Ligand binder design. Structure first.
Ligand SMILES: [Cl-]
Ligand SMILES: [Cl-]
Ligand SMILES: [Cl-]
Lengths: 290, 292
């Protein structure tokens, strides 16, 4: 866009890059792996027609700072980055939309800090308690999560993912799309630029090492996780090659607030790229509802 | 059984435990993970009607020695253990039947030492060159091999697998079976005893660390592997949660000698437990009621 603006702001001891367009109610769009703000390229101008849209690069990604060490990527710290971002942007609360890791962070932010979240929207991101409790008993989820186990190993995943101009990552994306030409060559050049930022791949992989290591996946005991107390919308592409439907059933046990789920039976993990207008529509309607 | 006998023998620098029953033509039964000789409990007395059956515990398992270190579980060493066992049993060769890792070892033994193998029977074990070439290009195989990646981590998988009397491992097995009651309460007690042997879990996991680490899976090299020169029967349970059919089709470069494949469309990885009589019948027919 011409109206899209790049900004950097200090939050939670790190500098965060974001793009923004629009005025009004603050709406955050939070990417996951192996994306960055640009995954929201279709939604930013559309949502910016009625809202102040901010799409940051999460800790470790693209133009945001990249602290060294696995411990710097624990979910508690990632959610504190977003809490800090809302404060730094001059709001008491935001509408928070998260996909993939951005959605895991959003569930966490909303649970522990409901005062900062006006409404929560989740795209293809399991609730932490659901993944922690259920994965060990879902052979289909364990199989879909093969690469989570691969990413635990030091050094090798960085090497394999980066080889031949990130051929693996390009493939991972393509294999996940429900039409396999969903990204253009222009998109891919922009993705490679973000992937090639010094330290970005290791930092992204550290999310898996910090938060989805085998102790967490195969924990004998359930975790304590506060109920969600804000209205919540889940958008769920059912042909997700990374997440089994086993993990999104029954979110209401975790939510003490209005809850709605919109299934997209013929979309996969990148629902916002596959049905960009329907996704935008559902978001706008849910936010304008009250 | 009453006629089953336990023995220990020194081979390839380690002491190996095995059970034996029967007299006549020597037949080896080689288990995989997370089994030991006892996976062959149904087949041993039945095959002992026509063969001298020997079912060893592989290096690292149950009553066999358990050398320290990942490097001691490379496939070449494991195959040399079995070559040594055949020699130690007083014969020049044996019929070799292998399931899972025992099958991978059997492919390797047969390729590099064909004079020691009379005939080869493989149950749900991909040819090493097929797994090495194809896995990295097969999303379905990579997904099925989630646990291969899990097992690469030091210490943690041993802890998780062993906790609460091997609750994980029992679950892993059950989720892999397509028949009920393959493990009775009595069988489970016996399994837990073997699993609990000092160093056994680490040694079993070292097969995956030594031979199927991510560098090996994703390597852009083709592997050298001799052609199979002994008659070979592959038995394949199609509902295998661990191995994609991508890895068993198209053997043509790999085998020179006569080859037969028997698919079991309604069995999984543990085909010898799920259709024990049909599996035994195909083995007996192939070995003793052969062609040219
Ligand atoms: Cl749950
Ligand atoms: Cl749909
Ligand atoms: Cl069958």
């Amino acid at each position: 866009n011409e109206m899209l603006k790049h900004e950097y702001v200090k939050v939670n001891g790190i500098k965060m890059h974001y793009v923004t367009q629009g005025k009004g109610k603050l709406l955050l769009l939070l990417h996951g792996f192996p994306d960055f703000w640009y995954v929201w390229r279709f939604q930013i101008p559309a949502l910016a027609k009625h809202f102040r849209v901010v799409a940051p690069d999460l800790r470790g990604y693209n133009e945001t700072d990249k602290p060294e060490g696995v411990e710097n990527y624990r979910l508690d710290l990632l959610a504190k980055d977003i809490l800090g971002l809302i404060k730094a942007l001059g709001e008491e609360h935001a509408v928070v939309v998260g996909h993939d890791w951005g959605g895991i962070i959003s569930w966490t932010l909303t649970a522990f800090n409901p005062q900062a979240v006006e409404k929560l929207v989740i795209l293809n991101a399991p609730h932490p308690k659901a993944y922690m409790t259920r994965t060990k008993n879902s052979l289909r989820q364990l199989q879909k999560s093969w690469y989570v186990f691969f990413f635990q190993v030091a050094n090798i995943p960085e090497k394999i993912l980066s080889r031949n101009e990130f051929a693996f990552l390009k493939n991972m994306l393509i294999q996940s799309f429900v039409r396999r030409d969903l990204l253009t060559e222009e998109d891919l050049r922009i993705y490679v630029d973000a992937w090639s930022k010094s330290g970005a791949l290791t930092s992204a992989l550290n999310y898996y090492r910090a938060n989805l290591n085998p102790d967490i996946i195969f924990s004998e005991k359930t975790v304590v996780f506060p109920k969600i107390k804000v209205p919540t919308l889940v958008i769920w592409g059912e042909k997700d090659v990374a997440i089994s439907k086993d993990l999104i059933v029954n979110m209401e046990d975790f939510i003490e607030a209005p809850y709605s789920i919109k299934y997209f039976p013929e979309c996969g993990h990148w629902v916002q790229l596959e049905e960009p207008e329907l996704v935008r529509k559902h978001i706008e309607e849910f936010i304008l509802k009250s």
